[PDB]
Design a protein around this ligand. Structure first.
Ligand SMILES: [Zn+2]
Ligand SMILES: [Zn+2]
Ligand SMILES: [Zn+2]
Lengths: 159, 157, 157
């Protein structure tokens, strides 16, 4: 699917994405919220907190807020490989789940595949936020045990 | 056992428990300190740190510092299910362990069971702090491998 | 091998080692850099950052910057057992890796064993940074699953 652009202004780089990056991993997240990707992104590029992610994906679209080759602060691991080498994808509507979320998860499969192809990132380098810092994210994918299936679709699904 | 109330004042909600909450999980901690519940709570409800927990439990009593239906900042998972959907129970005297701590842990079984019954929280929703953010808490229960037995006690009594 | 004592001046202890410590655990890290043990330590002692580790090791030498019997902030567990009860050992060249790092790791096994027999720290008390805070460290070791073999080398020699 087409990944919509809505990057943060270069003037906030020092706050949202100060460092350049050579993508080597893709980190999947759940927002633990029920807001659309546009809202999630818009908020992330407007507030002045050192919190960010590359792309938000909901049941309808994918919107990019941080240049792919600049780091984001979403893996909570300081300057570890999480925040300094991975591209973060945030799946919307996970708080309450429902068709909206499962639809957004399917779109996220698309996004991860494009990113893997785009930066030549292998399937084994597709990770959960939890693998980097220990935080329970993506909470819904973890609690429902959907990670394994998500991975196989990205890996060999014809979607 | 009775859970005494020594709640934070309303004016400090924005810092200690800014959000209403619908209990879905119970998170167990170890304070890594050798102070009684009254001290742990008195300190937590008075200082101005955005750090808090619902109830402290020692070898003698159980004291609640935050309303059960308001979040607490004890899971370090920011705005995740840990800090927004679980009630935090802290077991005292874990720092040195001993009888005082074991008695406190057993009392915690009862407190946890009371919370489960009160908000119909299944046994599978009784979690450790570590499961939410990775911190080594409850340190003593994890170190001495007492979590399994804990769950069983809570399951029966 | 021999560990130098490029220890930070006692005047900076208040930030690198402001707490007396009784060594009970050993935490192994991965610098996530391509700099030698000399520069790592020499750096960690210059800046007045609230970050520090006890000893760094590379394919060449092993250097100590923080007194063994004093705490060091490197496990990111606030004031928990990780930071207040363990000796942090940082292995260099984890970023790029290669012969340097691998040789640096074999050396680290020597440093660990020395610390153990010196402070009677049992093999089960040799942990990763990850076990304390959930952080992915030592990254390369974990990525390559070299930990299980590491603990075995510490046992033997
Ligand atoms: Zn996340
Ligand atoms: Zn805890
Ligand atoms: Zn580390």
């Amino acid at each position: 699917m087409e990944i919509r652009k809505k990057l943060v202004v270069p003037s906030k780089y020092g706050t949202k994405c100060p460092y350049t990056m050579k993508p080597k991993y893709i980190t999947v997240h759940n927002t633990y919220n029920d807001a659309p990707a546009e809202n999630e992104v818009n908020y992330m590029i407007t507030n002045n907190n050192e919190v960010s992610f590359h792309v938000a994906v909901d049941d309808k679209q994918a919107i990019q807020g941080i240049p792919w080759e600049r780091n984001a602060w979403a893996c909570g691991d300081g300057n570890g490989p999480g925040n300094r080498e991975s591209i973060s994808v945030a799946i919307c509507y996970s708080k309450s789940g429902g068709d909206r979320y499962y639809k957004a998860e399917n779109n996220a499969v698309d996004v991860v595949r494009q990113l893997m192809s785009m930066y030549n990132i292998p399937i084994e380098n597709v990770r959960t936020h939890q693998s980097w810092s220990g935080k329970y994210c993506p909470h819904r994918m973890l609690a429902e045990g959907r990670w394994g299936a998500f991975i196989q679709k990205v890996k060999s699904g014809n979607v």
